[PDB]
Design a protein around this ligand. Sequence first.
Ligand SMILES: OC[C@H]1O[C@H](O[C@H]2[C@H](O)[C@@H](O)[C@H](O)O[C@@H]2CO)[C@H](O)[C@@H](O)[C@@H]1O
Length: 383
Amino acid sequence: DVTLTLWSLDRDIQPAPNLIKEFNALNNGIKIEYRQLQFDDVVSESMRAYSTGNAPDIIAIDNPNHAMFASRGAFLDVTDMIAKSDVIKTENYFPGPLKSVTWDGKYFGVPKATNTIALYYNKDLFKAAGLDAAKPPQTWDELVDAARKLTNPAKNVYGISFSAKANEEGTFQFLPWAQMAGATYKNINTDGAVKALETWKTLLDEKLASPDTLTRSQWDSTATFNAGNAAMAISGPWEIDRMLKDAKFDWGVTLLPVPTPDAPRSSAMGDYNWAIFSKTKHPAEAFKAIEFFASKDKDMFKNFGQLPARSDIPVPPTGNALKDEALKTFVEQLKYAQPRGPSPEWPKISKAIQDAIQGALSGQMTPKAALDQAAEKIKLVDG
Ligand SMILES: OC[C@H]1O[C@H](O[C@H]2[C@H](O)[C@@H](O)[C@H](O)O[C@@H]2CO)[C@H](O)[C@@H](O)[C@@H]1O
């Protein structure tokens, strides 16, 4: 057999290792050995590996990181193999995800999936508080008021759960709020972005969200929602299958509330891309593996609750009512997602945003000072 290696953050029950097990069973002359990364290690360490000669054949890389590797020659140019493919077609892909694998008019990967975040809510806790579970919050004011009503320390419940962690989690969580109020990562210190960061301060200052929001991932925050310890959760479709298993209450999911009535919806484009490292000894076999993964995209939602990065295969209902309502919401919010980048310096941009979030939420800097400092850094690095 040709033996390939593949690195991803996907947990044992998420797509990558399960796709690998199905692929290996084909006995097609190719085998894949999986290594699970940690979220926080996929990047500067996979760059270390590439630079030393320790890189795998294949990686699933977060979409905003793709340009760093592609621009540096770390990823294989798959343009010709895509053109020849009878399985992968570039016109199948949503334009944002496709753009994220491109550099200088060449393809340097194939999108794996796509997502964005939305607002989960526990309808039983809404009802118990005298709230209308059929009318979840539409604006930031309504969201904050609901979160106040739902915050009940005597019952071990926070009104809301989210993530402000000092890594890509916090940036991905924050950008939607800043964008809805008219800012972007290229202009992150507008009065609207300040208002977004003030609103986060309110959530923490009034103890409507756990203080662990500052250090806790989206996944670990949503676990608290699933357990009934937070009445609402801002997170992605990657939560659905676990929530179905673990949440023992009635729940819904809706679009992210907007800053003023009928202000624009907005969020950030999530999820990963497949890429082949440039010095692979097995480019054809690695690409065959990615063709196989792409061939399974049609089953991704039903089997894993994640969303393909493709317009050719709109996701059908599963038949589970909760899951199908979540699908409708995520499909609708995704229509408002904006890309982080393209930028080969995304991590530096993101770090500037992370530091502003931490500076303001900790009370060390005002929101305005914090975001002014981020914007100055971004102006330099995004040049
Ligand atoms: O933390 C920011 C990133 O959030 C998501 O990444 C998910 C991943 O999709 C999911 O499978 C998993 O269980 O964990 C992380 C969430 O904690 C987005 O997909 C990324 O694009 C974001 O940058």
